[PDB]
């Protein structure tokens, strides 16, 4: 009856995306070194540079302002 | 002649375990139930397990096919899985030789 496991594993790993291709590849190489492969475990963002912006405009969350502090030992 | 109707060591079965490269599509082929050390997939040095140096010592019970190929990567990788594939008869297993110019790398002996 191994046969239905076989075709189990089979449409399993036909099914299979390019996305658990990269994640295998990546983790066969973390056991062959040695590392844990838990902790490898994606970047749906669009990021731009506001130079000098109108003092109007409102500030976002996960916002970074660009800072020119004075000098400390000064 | 009867008509056509109109209506109608043992080796393990298995994938190989760790694919050379990203698309490489899984098949299902003849497969050694332990990993075979790196030693013991060369056919020039005598290693641990055997002492054979050529064809010769092995002793084959089928005939070779021998690759003479410059370097060893996933090309012929893919000339490998269609020789192992679960299908092909496991008795008529021909032992491939790869006779190679440079000394293979860990990934390409890993993979085979
Ligand atoms: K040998
Ligand atoms: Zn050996």
């Given at each position: 009856a191994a046969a239905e496991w076989i075709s189990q594993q089979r449409l399993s790993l036909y099914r299979r995306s390019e996305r658990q291709e990269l994640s295998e590849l990546v983790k066969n190489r973390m056991k062959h070194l040695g590392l844990?492969?838990?902790?490898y475990d994606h970047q749906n963002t669009l990021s731009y540079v506001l130079i000098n912006?109108?003092?109007d405009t409102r500030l976002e969350p996960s916002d970074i302002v660009y800072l020119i502090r004075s000098d400390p030992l000064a | 002649i009867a008509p056509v109707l109109e209506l109608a060591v043992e080796y393990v079965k298995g994938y190989?375990?760790?694919?050379?490269?990203?698309?490489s599509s899984p098949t299902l082929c003849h497969l050694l139930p332990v990993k075979a050390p790196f030693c013991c997939l060369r056919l020039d040095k005598g290693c641990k397990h055997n002492s054979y140096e050529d064809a010769k010592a092995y002793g084959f019970k089928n005939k070779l096919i021998i690759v003479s190929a410059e370097t060893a990567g996933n090309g012929l990788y893919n000339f490998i899985v269609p020789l192992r594939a679960?299908?092909?008869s496991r008795k008529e297993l021909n032992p491939i030789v790869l006779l190679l110019d440079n000394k293979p790398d860990h990934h390409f002996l890993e993979a085979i």
């Open positions: 844990p492969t838990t902790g912006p109108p003092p | 190989p375990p760790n694919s050379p490269y990203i698309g679960y299908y092909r």
